[PDB]
């Protein structure tokens, strides 16, 4: 079996201090395919998990690596630790990317704009 470093949440995109946006404005640049997909599922959950997903995200970037810390210790403990999983696994399956999305992303998040809300709404 062995253990890679792809599990848990990825380390690249976890140890990255981007916004959501900033990663988010890569991602659709870098995989628009994959993107529109999580942004179908995006819009697809309702606003309330579409803000809950925000808000846990939001949390992410402000926490940094504390929330790295947190959120790989939460997930070590429990995958379904995460309260969200509870309402949507997928809240966060863009940023759950461990292909040349997670290198990819990691190394141009920290060129692109963190004001870019049209990541929010294409």
């Known amino acids: 079996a062995d253990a890679t470093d792809d599990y848990p949440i990825p380390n690249r995109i976890m140890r990255t201090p981007c916004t959501a946006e900033q990663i988010m404005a890569a991602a ?3 995989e628009p395919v994959y993107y529109e997909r999580y942004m179908t599922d995006y819009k697809n959950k309702p606003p309330h998990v579409q ?5 846990r995200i939001h949390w992410f970037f402000s ?11 939460n997930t070590a403990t429990d995958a379904f630790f995460e309260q969200l999983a509870w309402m949507w696994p997928n809240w966060a399956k863009l940023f759950f990317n461990n292909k040349g999305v997670a290198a990819n992303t990691t190394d141009v998040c920290e060129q692109y704009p ?3 809300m049209s990541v929010w709404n294409w």
């Open 28 to 30: 659709r640049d870098v």
């Open 63 to 73: 926490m940094d690596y504390a929330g790295r810390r947190q959120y790989s210790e």
């Open 114 to 116: 963190p004001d870019d």
């Open 51 to 55: 803000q809950a997903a925000r808000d």
